[PDB]
Structure 1
Amino acid sequence: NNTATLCLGHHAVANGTLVKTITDDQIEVTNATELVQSISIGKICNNSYRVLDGRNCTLIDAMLGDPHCDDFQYENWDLFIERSSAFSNCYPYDIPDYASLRSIVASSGTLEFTAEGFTWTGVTQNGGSGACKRGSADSFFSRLNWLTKSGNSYPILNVTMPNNKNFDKLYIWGIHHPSSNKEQTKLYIQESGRVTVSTERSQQTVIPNIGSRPWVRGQSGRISIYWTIVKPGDILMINSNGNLVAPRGYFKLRTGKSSVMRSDALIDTCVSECITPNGSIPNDKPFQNVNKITYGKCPKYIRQNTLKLATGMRNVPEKQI
């Protein structure tokens, strides 16, 4: 014997997997890994971020102080969760540019409220309604103050509050739209009311519109909600001759990592740094196909449900004949 044969080669597997390349739509490699997260844990994990269940309250109603949302009073969150079963149970109201108020509050992350000593001399305070039952009593939004005539008259209110703090103050205030002319004169004496809220740099003026609107929770009138942000060094001023829904204090505005999300998912104990409305997802892969709405440390949303990254050579199995 005086020769030998030496052959070079490479491995192959029984079950390879197809991937895409620059030149081929499908070509078989020995192994691949999935880069698209397309399944969700099914629930929202509360161990990495502070997730708050809003239950039957919108963030807005909880801010306003709708009786059935009382327990949300000094609550904070990283993510606030809005249920599609949420409902308002106070006076019928509407908020011009609602979306912005919701966003501002959501971002702030807290509902911590600070009462201030507004003096309303010559008017009675703490007005309530049948539409807004608290326990068993006719009541109102805990953060708002319904002002009406004090026996005899309703004088021109002229109130100021300095912002000597070092953060922006958010003030919530409004106006009552009466359903009839005698309702207007019964509560506020004057035939046509007004609210002006101003600072050194901004002014807002609102005139009520007396009249009937569709019947809601007993009421034909409305309450319009507005907001004002007062900067450090500036001063809030409230000028009115009637129909004022007064503010009781301010919410503290924090620049933060907080948000709100609409979900009906279960909320439980697990670990995950990425929240979608479908529930949490792992973030081991760089891309996801679960939902374009996400919060946290998340793979990027893409339209593809699958993308395979080759982790092996071209698979060329032995001839089967």
Structure 2
Amino acid sequence: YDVPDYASLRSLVASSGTLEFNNESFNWTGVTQNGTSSACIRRSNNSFFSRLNWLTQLNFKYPALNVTMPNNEQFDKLYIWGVHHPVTDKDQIFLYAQSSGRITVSTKRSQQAVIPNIGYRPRIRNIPSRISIYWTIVKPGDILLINSTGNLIAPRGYFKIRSGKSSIMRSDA
């Protein structure tokens, strides 16, 4: 993976001091969820990140995903989603069945539009692809709308965020 803004995500998560992950039931229809990879082994089995969801074509089809998730609670939500960049046009057609993907995650106050960039990268653990990870903060009363047509690493739920005295440290003591 490769976070485009590593220091920004590392600061607000460390300042919250909590990882209370709550699962939310989305409506991913027409796609195959729970995609696994051979470079991320869990209990001698192929697995992925536990807080993300890899979406893959179903019966050589991939309908456009228009799934909303309103925030009716009284605290801010931190959604962690990702964009997967393939290596070749053959792998893009094999995985998402569309030669040009696009991901749009928008709220009432902000919008994020990330287009995948197919290309080669240096191999890490015999994998030449990369994943870019973005975060979205949803206010109370705001509505999270996720629209994409491929190459989307869907989130599994929201991360609770608060303000406290927590911080981060780099030491070997």
| TM-score (norm: length of structure 2) | 0.98
| Among candidates 165, 168, 173, match of residue 76 of structure 2 | 168
- 1:151 and 1:219 map into 2 onto residues whose CA distance is 25
1:156 aligns with 2:64: yes
Kindly tell me the number of residue pairs found equivalent between the two proteins.
Answer: 173
| Among candidates 144, 155, 163, match of residue 247 of structure 1 | 155
Q: Report the 3-state secondary structure (helix = DSSP H, G, I; strand = E; otherwise coil) of the residue aligned with 1:196.
A: strand
Deviations 1:15-51 (A, max 9, x none): xxxxxxxxxxxxxxxxxxxxxxxxxxxxxxxxxxxxx
Deviations 1:192-241 (A, max 9, x none): 11110000111000111111100011111100000000000000010000
How is 1:119-158 mapped onto 2 (pairs within 5 angstroms)?
Answer: 119-158=27-66
Identity %: 74
User: Structure 1: where are the runs of 5+ without partners?
Assistant: 1-92, 266-321
- 2:15 and 2:62 map into 1 onto residues whose CA distance is 38
Q: Report the 3-state secondary structure (helix = DSSP H, G, I; strand = E; otherwise coil) of the residue aligned with 2:4.
A: coil
Measured on the aligned residues, the alpha-carbon RMSD in Å equals 0.6
- 1:100 and 1:220 map into 2 onto residues whose CA distance is 26
Q: Report the 3-state secondary structure (helix = DSSP H, G, I; strand = E; otherwise coil) of the residue aligned with 1:105.
A: helix
Report the residue type matching 2:109 in the other structure. Answer: R
| TM-score (norm: length of structure 1) | 0.53
Q: Report the 3-state secondary structure (helix = DSSP H, G, I; strand = E; otherwise coil) of the residue aligned with 1:94.
A: coil
Structure 1 segments of 4 or more deviating over 4 A? none
1:40 aligns with none
Q: Report the 3-state secondary structure (helix = DSSP H, G, I; strand = E; otherwise coil) of the residue aligned with 2:33.
A: strand
1:263 aligns with 2:141: no
Tell me which of the two structures has the higher relative contact order, counting C-alpha pairs closer than 8 angstroms and 6 or more residues apart.
2
- 2:6 and 2:103 map into 1 onto residues whose CA distance is 19
2:132 aligns with 224
| Among candidates 165, 182, 197, match of residue 90 of structure 2 | 182
- 1:253 and 1:112 map into 2 onto residues whose CA distance is 8
Shift of 1:152: 2.5
Deviations 1:246-268 (A, max 9, x none): 00111111111101100110xxx
Report the residue type matching 2:80 in the other structure. Answer: I
How is 1:25-64 mapped onto 2 (pairs within 5 angstroms)?
Answer: none
